[PDB]
Amino acid sequence: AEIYNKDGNKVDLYGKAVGLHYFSKGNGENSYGGNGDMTYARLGFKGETQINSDLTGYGQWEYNFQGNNSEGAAAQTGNKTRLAFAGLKYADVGSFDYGRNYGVVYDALGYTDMLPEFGGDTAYSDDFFVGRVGGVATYRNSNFFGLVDGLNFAVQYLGKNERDTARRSNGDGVGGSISYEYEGFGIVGAYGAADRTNLQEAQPLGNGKKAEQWATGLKYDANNIYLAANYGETRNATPITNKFTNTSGFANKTQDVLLVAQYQFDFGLRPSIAYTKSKAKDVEGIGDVDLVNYFEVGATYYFNKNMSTYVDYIINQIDSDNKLGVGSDDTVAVGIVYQF
Amino acid sequence: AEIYNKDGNKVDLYGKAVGLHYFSKGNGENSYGGNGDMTYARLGFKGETQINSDLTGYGQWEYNFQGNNSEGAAAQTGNKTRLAFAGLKYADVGSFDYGRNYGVVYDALGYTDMLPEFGGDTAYSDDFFVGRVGGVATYRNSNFFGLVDGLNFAVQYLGKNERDTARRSNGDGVGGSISYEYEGFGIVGAYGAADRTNLQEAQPLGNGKKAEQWATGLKYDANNIYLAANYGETRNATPITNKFTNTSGFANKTQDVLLVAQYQFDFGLRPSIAYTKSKAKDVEGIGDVDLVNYFEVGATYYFNKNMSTYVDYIINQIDSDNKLGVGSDDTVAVGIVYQF
Amino acid sequence: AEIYNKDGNKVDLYGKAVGLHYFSKGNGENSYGGNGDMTYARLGFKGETQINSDLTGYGQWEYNFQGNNSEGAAAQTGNKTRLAFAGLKYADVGSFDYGRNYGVVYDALGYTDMLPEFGGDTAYSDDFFVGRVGGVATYRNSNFFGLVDGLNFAVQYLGKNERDTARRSNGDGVGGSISYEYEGFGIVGAYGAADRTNLQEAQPLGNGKKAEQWATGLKYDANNIYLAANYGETRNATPITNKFTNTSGFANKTQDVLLVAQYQFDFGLRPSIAYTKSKAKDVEGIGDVDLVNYFEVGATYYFNKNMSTYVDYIINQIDSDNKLGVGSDDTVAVGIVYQF
């Protein structure tokens, strides 16, 4: 909600209180989504000042407050900053911004990252360029310097983040994305590569000195319809865990596919059919094993811009003997959303 | 403070900076309230959109930021989300909401939960239905479908929350409250029962498979006067610790009583006299022992809606040989409040 | 940004998204500032209600959200409340406020605490009176009861805070500051002393029962120029660590000096030259050793009140054999700031 707009500066204060519960069977970790209460809230600000007609500055911070902890010592679990960055936008030369933000390959992966609750499975956090990272400098240009409507690109520089954990670290890397949109059609390509930190290299799973990820995207988004497809591959980047052994590291390679079809009824309903498969190849010891494999069916009802409800059902195709331990049970999720 | 109100949506952004200090003697844990600096702040949002004349959506999130930690590693201590839920309200059919919220038995207990700083001792957090819980679905109806002015009720479904700690877990349970108000008189009844988790059952104190709590309330709240009385009992639900032994668990039974009398002078002052006793019966090993027992005297001066000050004095009646280790010293608390 | 102003109450909701990166060499801890991504955000509220023409109430809370953590388990690192207090201001009698706030000696030290990114090195957090503390009651008077324009003073009472850590605890202490300003000239004196807690006394470095700190300040701040000098000394208060041995405690004495010169071009640029030295004397085992010693050069460009950029360069004078392990490398820091 735009709570401030004066003298060139305009501030948007935003957030949401999401009452959400997941249903599975088990103890719920042969399931996809797990099980039980998963309520949470979000708070953020989006600022934008007009330094002059050509020049704009902006900043953004967004936090996540879990809503299913007790008020004891574990109160904070799951709490974190998703985004925190500032930057400048100059006439048609481009925008530049620095901070904790979405990696460039997410430029592609975001196409199919639209289910009511699940989806976007290959867009992991703190994972080189596919999801939200820390320390990235991102240059983005639109319509090629104002000369070609609809043709955009970006380059992104990723700084080393030697973290406690091999799962959330990264060496320096570079990535870029090119994308073209026209009359409801959108096509994208993204690619980044990086150095892996020493601790990454010590993990029993995956061998290599460099982290690569790329992804392609195609989409039709007009006339209330939304059809979208992503296809991408990664070398030494996706984190995997062998639950039997408890070993962990990165998949040597992954081939990933995501398809999404949605329709927006004018009375509020948005049915969604989606399909996702991601499989790791040449896993030291295991061979070819699926990480993610499912059909998804779901609906969002929008009462208005502020209120909505949804159900998201994962028909999990992962099978039961999965040699990494990936759980095979469906999960259903029901949520009620207030946002401003 | 209502910072946003446009197009059917209205947002209230609220909070308080409470400078507060408690005085006891000791080392301050033969005391009631403990001792020293206890400053804190609160931040929350309350949203409400009008989907149409009969239908309303709403959400709420409220957080607690301790103000007496250092800026080292213990900085976060005491930090948590009190509330986080969203829901819908439909004409006279009722409201429904899901999330982290007040349990139904608090519907009664809130009557006497009005001291300047202390009080509400039996309304514990994460304790089945008496204080704020996680995972509750709550249906509330007012004036019996619009047919009986002043007669209200609610049912509440509580989902299992298998937490790390027996103190903050719960199995599934159900509760309800009925209440009638008329010309300043208010009467209430509340009751919930639940399954106890396995870990609850492993604790050395208390034996049983089910958690019950009920409470009754009576109140006169008109003409600047506030008189209120609560009486309730609980079976296997109230958490107790044996400080000598260090054992812990739930009281087999408790009988609880709370009385409150306050008066609101028109120039700002609100004297408060209150009395509270809560006693656990049949404690494995101990027998009948008081948990809470005191007189309270105190005053709030309201400079206006935004500013106020208060003193709260607990004349602790707990005696010195208390066989559970419950501390017996008075505590005095002085606070200065800014809220918006 | 003033988001609320009605009926005597006015609320300011404020914050900043700071994209910031430090450059050093090493592994970056022979450096001054360390090295890598150091992005963060800040959020706070400042409230003020008018109880009547003479009487005002106010409160403030400000938090710090790190922006360089991953979204794993270390997500919260560096997160804390800087300020949290409430108070009253009465006509010319004075203001009084209680809570987590700046200690009185910071009244002086703030003169030179103006570099773009570094500086204010002797203003430590949770360190008796020089930086932000918890539990202080502060009385401040301006223009001596309205009788002497420009002559101000304050007294401050500091309560014992027995914390886990000797570094962040304190016994009770008292401090005051007197200060005079006139036509761009400002002069200040501040002094506080305190008892040290038992755990403080157990540390291998520093011997004594009392913590003292004082500081003096001189400043010219008019006509776009800013020249400022601080000189202060402390007995048993400044925390020091012997990195070779890993011992830790407080410097027996320190003599501290800080000088700052800045100029504000009307087109936005603010060059800064600064110099800082702080040295501990009579260190059990070491003798006289510098803690802080450097030249600093830097610039801030202000696009407007909301946006700005800066570079801050520390020409570290600490030498390489420093007998406490204090690192000797320069650090450069580049930041981009959005604030509202």
Side-chain angles (χ1 to χ4, degrees):
Chain A
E2 184 175 272
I3 71 186
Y4 184 90
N5 185 341
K6 134 140 65 265
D7 280 319
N9 195 25
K10 94 196 153 132
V11 190
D12 184 324
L13 182 67
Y14 72 88
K16 66 164 140 135
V18 164
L20 165 85
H21 197 98
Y22 294 173
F23 311 83
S24 285
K25 203 306 233 295
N27 209 106
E29 283 175 47
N30 188 57
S31 63
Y32 172 79
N35 167 95
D37 187 40
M38 296 279 157
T39 302
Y40 60 105
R42 285 299 165 59
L43 181 73
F45 68 75
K46 270 224 266 259
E48 181 189 307
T49 179
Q50 259 185 101
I51 306 122
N52 54 55
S53 300
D54 299 320
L55 193 45
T56 271
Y58 59 88
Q60 186 162 185
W61 160 79
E62 181 188 293
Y63 200 90
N64 170 73
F65 287 103
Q66 266 334 95
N68 53 355
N69 295 332
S70 76
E71 276 169 46
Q76 264 34 267
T77 308
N79 287 7
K80 70 208 162 233
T81 287
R82 291 145 66 68
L83 305 174
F85 58 87
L88 310 125
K89 196 168 192 163
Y90 185 23
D92 299 296
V93 170
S95 62
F96 166 79
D97 52 49
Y98 182 67
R100 183 175 167 83
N101 209 337
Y102 280 95
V104 249
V105 163
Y106 183 83
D107 271 3
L109 287 177
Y111 272 24
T112 68
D113 182 20
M114 310 247 313
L115 319 183
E117 161 80 357
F118 308 107
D121 302 72
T122 68
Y124 315 80
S125 268
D126 307 308
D127 190 26
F128 296 101
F129 292 101
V130 294
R132 291 182 310 275
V133 227
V136 296
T138 300
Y139 169 81
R140 289 185 175 279
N141 179 267
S142 316
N143 318 318
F144 200 75
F145 293 98
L147 307 165
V148 170
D149 283 335
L151 167 68
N152 301 333
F153 69 97
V155 41
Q156 198 191 65
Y157 297 97
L158 172 65
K160 162 139 86 22
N161 307 321
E162 248 216 346
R163 300 229 195 262
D164 278 272
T165 283
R167 168 63 185 91
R168 317 241 162 209
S169 309
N170 67 264
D172 308 283
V174 185
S177 85
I178 311 187
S179 83
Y180 180 70
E181 293 203 358
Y182 186 82
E183 194 178 349
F185 295 84
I187 181 176
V188 229
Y191 171 86
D195 304 340
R196 322 207 310 143
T197 67
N198 251 100
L199 189 57
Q200 283 176 323
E201 314 216 62
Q203 318 296 296
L205 277 171
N207 167 91
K209 301 125 276 114
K210 267 207 112 62
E212 297 170 61
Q213 290 146 359
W214 57 274
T216 311
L218 235 293
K219 118 225 180 154
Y220 178 65
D221 179 356
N223 285 326
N224 291 114
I225 308 134
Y226 190 89
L227 316 191
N230 265 134
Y231 175 84
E233 314 175 3
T234 63
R235 314 249 128 64
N236 327 300
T238 306
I240 71 192
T241 308
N242 190 328
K243 300 195 129 125
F244 306 120
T245 73
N246 251 290
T247 42
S248 266
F250 306 89
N252 253 110
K253 8 263 197 68
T254 69
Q255 339 231 197
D256 325 305
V257 197
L258 287 117
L259 320 129
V260 199
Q262 269 179 22
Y263 179 85
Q264 175 71 55
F265 281 97
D266 279 351
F267 61 85
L269 197 76
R270 216 192 150 83
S272 156
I273 279 299
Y275 165 71
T276 312
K277 175 133 109 95
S278 151
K279 63 161 327 197
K281 297 163 85 69
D282 301 311
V283 174
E284 23 282 284
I286 283 83
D288 292 20
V289 41
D290 288 345
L291 299 161
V292 175
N293 196 347
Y294 67 74
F295 293 77
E296 170 272 342
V297 189
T300 290
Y301 188 89
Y302 296 93
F303 298 89
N304 52 32
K305 319 173 168 180
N306 294 108
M307 204 74 202
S308 73
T309 311
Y310 64 85
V311 182
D312 203 359
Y313 183 35
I314 299 283
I315 291 137
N316 192 351
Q317 295 320 298
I318 278 261
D319 77 53
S320 349
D321 293 316
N322 169 295
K323 255 40 263 154
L324 277 188
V326 173
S328 41
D329 292 304
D330 307 355
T331 292
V332 180
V334 191
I336 152 141
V337 188
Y338 172 87
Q339 84 176 33
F340 69 95
Chain B
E2 184 175 272
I3 71 186
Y4 184 90
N5 185 341
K6 134 140 65 265
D7 280 319
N9 195 25
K10 94 196 153 132
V11 190
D12 184 324
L13 182 67
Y14 72 88
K16 66 164 140 135
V18 164
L20 165 85
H21 197 98
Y22 294 173
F23 311 83
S24 285
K25 203 306 233 295
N27 209 106
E29 283 175 47
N30 188 57
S31 63
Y32 172 79
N35 167 95
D37 187 40
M38 296 279 157
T39 302
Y40 60 105
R42 285 299 165 59
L43 181 73
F45 68 75
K46 270 224 266 259
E48 181 189 307
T49 179
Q50 259 185 101
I51 306 122
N52 54 55
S53 300
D54 299 320
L55 193 45
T56 271
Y58 59 88
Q60 186 162 185
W61 160 79
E62 181 188 293
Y63 200 90
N64 170 73
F65 287 103
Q66 266 334 95
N68 53 355
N69 295 332
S70 76
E71 276 169 46
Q76 264 34 267
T77 308
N79 287 7
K80 70 208 162 233
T81 287
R82 291 145 66 68
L83 305 174
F85 58 87
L88 310 125
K89 196 168 192 163
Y90 185 23
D92 299 296
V93 170
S95 62
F96 166 79
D97 52 49
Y98 182 67
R100 183 175 167 83
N101 209 337
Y102 280 95
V104 249
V105 163
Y106 183 83
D107 271 3
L109 287 177
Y111 272 24
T112 68
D113 182 20
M114 310 247 313
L115 319 183
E117 161 80 357
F118 308 107
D121 302 72
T122 68
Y124 315 80
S125 268
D126 307 308
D127 190 26
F128 296 101
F129 292 101
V130 294
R132 291 182 310 275
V133 227
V136 296
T138 300
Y139 169 81
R140 289 185 175 279
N141 179 267
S142 316
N143 318 318
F144 200 75
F145 293 98
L147 307 165
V148 170
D149 283 335
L151 167 68
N152 301 333
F153 69 97
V155 41
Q156 198 191 65
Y157 297 97
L158 172 65
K160 162 139 86 22
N161 307 321
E162 248 216 346
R163 300 229 195 262
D164 278 272
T165 283
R167 168 63 185 91
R168 317 241 162 209
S169 309
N170 67 264
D172 308 283
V174 185
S177 85
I178 311 187
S179 83
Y180 180 70
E181 293 203 358
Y182 186 82
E183 194 178 349
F185 295 84
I187 181 176
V188 229
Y191 171 86
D195 304 340
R196 322 207 310 143
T197 67
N198 251 100
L199 189 57
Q200 283 176 323
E201 314 216 62
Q203 318 296 296
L205 277 171
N207 167 91
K209 301 125 276 114
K210 267 207 112 62
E212 297 170 61
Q213 290 146 359
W214 57 274
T216 311
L218 235 293
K219 118 225 180 154
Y220 178 66
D221 179 356
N223 285 326
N224 291 114
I225 308 134
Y226 190 89
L227 316 191
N230 265 134
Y231 175 84
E233 314 175 3
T234 63
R235 314 249 128 64
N236 327 300
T238 306
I240 71 192
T241 308
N242 190 328
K243 300 195 129 125
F244 306 120
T245 73
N246 251 290
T247 42
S248 266
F250 306 89
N252 253 110
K253 8 263 197 68
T254 69
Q255 339 231 197
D256 325 305
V257 197
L258 287 117
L259 320 129
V260 199
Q262 269 179 22
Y263 179 85
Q264 175 71 55
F265 281 97
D266 279 351
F267 61 85
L269 197 76
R270 216 192 150 83
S272 157
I273 279 299
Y275 165 71
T276 312
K277 175 133 109 95
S278 151
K279 63 161 327 197
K281 297 163 85 69
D282 301 311
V283 174
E284 23 282 284
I286 283 83
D288 292 20
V289 41
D290 288 345
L291 299 161
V292 175
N293 196 347
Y294 67 74
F295 293 77
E296 170 272 342
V297 189
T300 290
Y301 188 89
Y302 296 93
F303 298 89
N304 52 32
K305 319 173 168 180
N306 294 108
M307 204 74 202
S308 73
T309 311
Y310 64 85
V311 182
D312 203 359
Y313 183 35
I314 299 283
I315 291 137
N316 192 351
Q317 295 320 298
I318 278 261
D319 77 53
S320 349
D321 293 316
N322 169 295
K323 255 40 263 154
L324 277 188
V326 173
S328 41
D329 292 304
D330 307 355
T331 292
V332 180
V334 191
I336 152 141
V337 188
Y338 172 87
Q339 84 176 33
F340 69 95
Chain C
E2 184 175 272
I3 71 186
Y4 184 90
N5 185 341
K6 134 140 65 265
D7 280 319
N9 195 25
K10 94 196 153 132
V11 190
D12 184 324
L13 182 67
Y14 72 88
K16 66 164 140 135
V18 164
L20 165 85
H21 197 98
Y22 294 173
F23 311 83
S24 285
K25 203 306 233 295
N27 209 106
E29 283 175 47
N30 188 57
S31 63
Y32 172 79
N35 167 95
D37 187 40
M38 296 279 157
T39 302
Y40 60 105
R42 285 299 165 59
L43 181 73
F45 68 75
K46 270 224 266 259
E48 181 189 307
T49 179
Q50 259 185 101
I51 306 122
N52 54 55
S53 300
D54 299 320
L55 193 45
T56 271
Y58 59 88
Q60 186 162 185
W61 160 79
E62 181 188 293
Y63 200 90
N64 170 73
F65 287 103
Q66 266 334 95
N68 53 355
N69 295 332
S70 76
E71 276 169 46
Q76 264 34 267
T77 308
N79 287 7
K80 70 208 162 233
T81 287
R82 291 145 66 68
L83 305 174
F85 58 87
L88 310 125
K89 196 168 192 163
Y90 185 23
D92 299 296
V93 170
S95 62
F96 166 79
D97 52 49
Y98 182 67
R100 183 175 167 83
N101 209 337
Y102 280 95
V104 249
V105 163
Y106 183 83
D107 271 3
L109 287 177
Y111 272 24
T112 68
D113 182 20
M114 310 247 313
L115 319 183
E117 161 80 357
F118 308 107
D121 302 72
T122 68
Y124 315 80
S125 268
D126 307 308
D127 190 26
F128 296 101
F129 292 101
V130 294
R132 291 182 310 275
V133 227
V136 296
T138 300
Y139 169 81
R140 289 185 175 279
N141 179 267
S142 316
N143 318 318
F144 200 75
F145 293 98
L147 307 165
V148 170
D149 283 335
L151 167 68
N152 301 333
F153 69 97
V155 41
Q156 198 191 65
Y157 297 97
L158 172 65
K160 162 139 86 22
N161 307 321
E162 248 216 346
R163 300 229 195 262
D164 278 272
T165 283
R167 168 63 185 91
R168 317 241 162 209
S169 309
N170 67 264
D172 308 283
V174 185
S177 85
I178 311 187
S179 83
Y180 180 70
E181 293 203 358
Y182 186 82
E183 194 178 349
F185 295 84
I187 181 176
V188 229
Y191 171 86
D195 304 340
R196 322 207 310 143
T197 67
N198 251 100
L199 189 57
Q200 283 176 323
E201 314 216 62
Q203 318 296 296
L205 277 171
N207 167 91
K209 301 125 276 114
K210 267 207 112 62
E212 297 170 61
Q213 290 146 359
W214 57 274
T216 311
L218 235 293
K219 118 225 180 154
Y220 178 66
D221 179 356
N223 285 326
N224 291 114
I225 308 134
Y226 190 89
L227 316 191
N230 265 134
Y231 175 84
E233 314 175 3
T234 63
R235 314 249 128 64
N236 327 300
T238 306
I240 71 192
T241 308
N242 190 328
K243 300 195 129 125
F244 306 120
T245 73
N246 251 290
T247 42
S248 266
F250 306 89
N252 253 110
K253 8 263 197 68
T254 69
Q255 339 231 197
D256 325 305
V257 197
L258 287 117
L259 320 129
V260 199
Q262 269 179 22
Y263 179 85
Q264 175 71 55
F265 281 97
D266 279 351
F267 61 85
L269 197 76
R270 216 192 150 83
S272 157
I273 279 299
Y275 165 71
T276 312
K277 175 133 109 95
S278 151
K279 63 161 327 197
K281 297 163 85 69
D282 301 311
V283 174
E284 23 282 284
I286 283 83
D288 292 20
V289 41
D290 288 345
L291 299 161
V292 175
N293 196 347
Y294 67 74
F295 293 77
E296 170 272 342
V297 189
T300 290
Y301 188 89
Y302 296 93
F303 298 89
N304 52 32
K305 319 173 168 180
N306 294 108
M307 204 74 202
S308 73
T309 311
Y310 64 85
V311 182
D312 203 359
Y313 183 35
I314 299 283
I315 291 137
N316 192 351
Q317 295 320 298
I318 278 261
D319 77 53
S320 349
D321 293 316
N322 169 295
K323 255 40 263 154
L324 277 188
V326 173
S328 41
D329 292 304
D330 307 355
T331 292
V332 180
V334 191
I336 152 141
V337 188
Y338 172 87
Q339 84 176 33
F340 69 95

